[PDB]
Design a protein around this ligand. Structure first.
Ligand SMILES: *Cc1ccc(C(=O)N2CC(OC)C2)cc1
Ligand SMILES: *Cc1ccc(C(=O)N2CC(OC)C2)cc1
Ligand SMILES: [Cl-]
Ligand SMILES: [Cl-]
Lengths: 227, 9, 227, 9
């Protein structure tokens, strides 16, 4: 996207979102990142929404095919699951490459740095979901380390009701439960996160209250499923 | 177990 | 897909459908067609489902962007609508190329020949939806001619309740209403189609009755909208 | 005005 203006890439990412063209949206936001400038709050959200949708479709397809493949145990189902898996890994690697070159190193504010590090944990978590071989353990540790660094910053620099802090804790708790085989850590994190946010709600405006309680309900839904 | 649905913004 | 077995392409098209990976499904079925053998009833359906889903997403995106573009009347919205439009036209041209090389000429049975000709009318209709310039009239006539040839065969060779005959009449009526600016022809065709099918229902098994009445309801829904 | 939903088979 080197010949298109940064502002035009951003404009077209917003159009692609409205058109539910998430692959285009991701390519436009990839082009915007590669312009080399830091991203605003809104632009970070566009980048995140685009790739979450793209990899979300790939994960859903991979799960369908992995399920069929396990019920079967010709080479077609395995071959096609492998194809989808490779395409998913390529998208995760692309996002991780954007964070590494050079979004994270240039992110100094807590809101941007926690946002990108949560992203890094998420896309390593997606890699871990399909990993088996010699690097599954290393991929899991890469996810844990990104989430942990993001947690440490958010606890120091953000209020307990901050939606990024809450969504980070939500996804790290899912990491603990689904990836790290640590359901007690998952439940403890979600419950402490929920309780500390509840006690901070009195400080918020009506609109911030709606934003925070929405994500607290997601924590509560998980706790209900897990206990 | 639901992660953040960051599918719309 | 030249190096993959025909049967493997068919198998993977079915897997892609289950995974809701319609672009893959279309590429697999394109590869199957290009093996040069005629397609079975089930294989024709796979080909049709794949491309209907792909172009269906493109049409939905084009309509979103065309609406935004009309509300605005920079170049971004037009440029992006053009990009989507070109990609849609490329998919329609690909399907039309498959029918022309060489599905239609090798289709001798009424069920296959009507099926492919209905397809041809549909993908010219999709081209007509986005056409403006010197060829909009010729594209519309190409759609009408394919539908008309299919109609003539289906009236001669199929019972009035045959689902392909009913779906052909449904889409030709939509062509009349939406493309050809002939709403009276659309209403007359849908009503005569519905009435002649109703009178033939007594001949059908329980399962054929369900298949036919399902499509008759689609005709009825349109008549309710149009009258 | 609905055409055939041939989206599933
Ligand atoms: C990591 C993250 C993403 C999004 C939010 C948020 O405020 N959300 C989810 C939905 O929009 C994407 C409401 C919090 C944290
Ligand atoms: C042209 C056409 C396609 C499909 C049918 C049919 O029998 N349908 C629609 C749904 O499956 C695709 C039930 C009829 C005619
Ligand atoms: Cl494959
Ligand atoms: Cl564009």
């Amino acid at each position: 996207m080197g010949s298109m203006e940064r502002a035009s890439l951003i404009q077209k990412a917003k159009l692609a979102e409205q058109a539910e063209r998430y692959e285009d949206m991701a390519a436009f936001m990839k082009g915007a990142v590669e312009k080399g400038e830091e991203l605003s709050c809104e632009e970070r959200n566009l980048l995140s929404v685009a790739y979450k949708n793209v990899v979300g479709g790939q994960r859903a397809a991979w799960r369908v095919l992995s399920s069929i493949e396990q019920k079967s145990n010709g080479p077609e189902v395995r071959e096609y699951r492998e194809k989808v898996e490779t395409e998913l890994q390529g998208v995760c690697d692309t996002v991780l490459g954007l964070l590494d070159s050079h979004l994270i190193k240039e992110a100094g504010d807590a809101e941007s740095r926690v946002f990108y590090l949560k992203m890094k944990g998420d896309y390593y978590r997606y890699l871990a979901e399909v990993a088996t071989g010699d690097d599954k353990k290393r991929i899991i540790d890469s996810a844990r380390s990104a989430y942990q660094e993001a947690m440490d910053i958010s606890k120091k620099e953000m209020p307990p009701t901050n939606p990024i802090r809450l969504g980070l804790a939500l996804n790290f708790s899912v990491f603990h439960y689904e990836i790290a085989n640590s359901p007690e850590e998952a439940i403890s994190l979600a419950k402490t996160t929920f309780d500390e946010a509840m006690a901070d709600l009195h400080t918020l405006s009506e609109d911030s209250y709606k934003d925070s309680t929405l994500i607290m309900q997601l924590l509560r839904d998980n706790l209900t499923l897990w206990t | 177990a639901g992660s953040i649905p960051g599918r719309r913004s």
